[PDB]
């Protein structure tokens, strides 16, 4: 009675509007897509009376599935509305990233674990229990629900592309169990290679060219000297974000009992995920040893 806990599934913010959060939980970096993950129905479980007054388990699990399908269905529609109803790679990737995060929430292997997410975790603890075999029971429940949730996320494209529908987003890929940190490095990298050309483009309009072929515009010119300070802000953040994500990866990779074909370091994930990735170019970029920062920002 006004005591009802509720987290609304609001419109998705413009891509890269809010950067990766490396401050909230300092061991990890959270993407704004994850913070905005639709959890309306999962969160609502805190308010459900002890309907245990006349129920058991198999039922609880089924209730959970129906509620999770609804949150996944909303997420799918809102993500499509974010990509401006364009049924492309960008959308498929988000469906993969978000499907993945629902799985980690259920498995109790998610890295947000704060506020409403701590509330969703406690809700799942109430359904499944807290014994040693509770986490596997959860993992099992996920392995029997994971494809239904992906088909639930795709409902929006299906309903909107009636019969004029193709499988641009493949099941086998989206429903593939991978560690959270691996999936987020894939998402971060993708965001990075988008931010980067823009960031070099603004640094160029103010700094490319010499004061009669001899002297850099970054030496005596303030509009440029400024562009360098602001590009430095961005590259400083991405470097921090990278080192944080990289460390988490190292920790997780060791704990993991499952071998990932080809994945040895975080660099291997980007080389896998991104088209034409070069780790020497990346390493130089994040460490201000790139052609652009030297040629446009140092005297």
């Amino acid at each position: 009675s006004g005591n009802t806990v509720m987290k609304n599934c609001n419109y998705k913010r413009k891509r890269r509007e809010r950067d990766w959060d490396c401050n909230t939980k300092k061991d990890v970096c959270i993407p704004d897509r994850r913070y905005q993950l639709c959890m309306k129905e999962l969160t609502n479980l805190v308010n459900n009376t002890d309907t245990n007054f006349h129920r058991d388990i198999t039922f609880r699990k089924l209730y959970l599935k129906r509620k999770l399908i609804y949150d996944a269905a909303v997420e799918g529609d809102l993500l499509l509305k974010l990509n401006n109803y364009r049924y492309n790679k960008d959308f498929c990737k988000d469906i993969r990233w978000s499907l993945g995060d629902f799985g980690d929430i259920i498995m109790g292997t998610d890295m947000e674990g704060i506020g409403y997410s701590k509330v969703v975790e406690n809700n799942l603890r109430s359904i499944f229990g807290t014994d040693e075999k509770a986490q596997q029971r959860r993992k099992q429940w996920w392995n029997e629900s994971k494809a239904q949730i992906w088909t639930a996320m795709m409902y929006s494209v299906k309903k909107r592309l009636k019969g004029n529908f193709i499988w641009i987003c493949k099941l086998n890929v989206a429903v593939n169990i991978e560690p959270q940190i691996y999936r987020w490095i894939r998402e971060w990298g993708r965001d990075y290679v988008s931010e980067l050309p823009t960031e070099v483009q603004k640094l160029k309009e103010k700094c490319d060219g010499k004061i009669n072929y001899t002297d850099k515009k970054v030496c005596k010119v303030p509009p440029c000297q400024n562009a360098c300070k602001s590009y430095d802000q961005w590259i400083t953040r991405k470097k921090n974000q990278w080192d944080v994500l990289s460390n988490k990866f190292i920790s997780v990779k060791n704990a993991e009992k499952v071998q990932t074909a080809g994945i040895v370091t975080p660099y291997d994930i980007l080389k896998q995920e991104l088209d034409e990735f070069n780790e020497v170019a990346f390493e130089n970029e994040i460490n201000k040893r790139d052609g652009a920062y030297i040629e446009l920002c140092v005297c």
Partner: antibody
Amino acid sequence: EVQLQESGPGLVKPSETLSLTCTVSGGSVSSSTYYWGWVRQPPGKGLEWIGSIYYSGSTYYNPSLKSRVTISVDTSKNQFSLKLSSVTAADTAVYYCARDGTGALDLWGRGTLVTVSS
Amino acid sequence: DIVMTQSPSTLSASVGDRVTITCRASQSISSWLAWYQQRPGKAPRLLIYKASSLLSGVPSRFGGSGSGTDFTLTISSLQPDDFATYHCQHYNTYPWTFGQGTKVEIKR
């Protein structure tokens, strides 16, 4: 799949100018992050860095050759070139073009042998 | 100008053997060292950058160690296609300079 290929005569008479060009395929030479360079390997000798260029035009040379070396960039043709003047038999070597990652040469060309002879 | 000194100039090991090459710098390089593999009839390839980072794609047997003046390339288990000449290179400051190279030969 970025790839590098050198082209140019394999025979130069002494005192004449040595020209070679590298041509970038599978990507652009207009890289905002990489430099493009030349490396030499004289017979029975170690590797020597000749110089590198950024697509903007900014050039870096080895004092060892700075006297008679010039490296150009044709962003239009997706190429970069080497010109080493007044050659001697000390300039007979295998010439490689490489992608210069501010010191880490992460992609090389196959190399071309230039023999200085009359 | 900095001077790079590789030791030995040549070495012979058997397949499966642990082999180590060293690169000694004249001045101190802050671990700005690159290691290249030149196999016969092949262009040099980058194996290791920043003294110890193993480039993605190159075999797991290659390991780089060191900082300052003394560096080591280590091949944990020699293979027939490891018959090549290995070159070290600094990138601390212009000009970039290479060591003379170490020829690795396979006992059979």
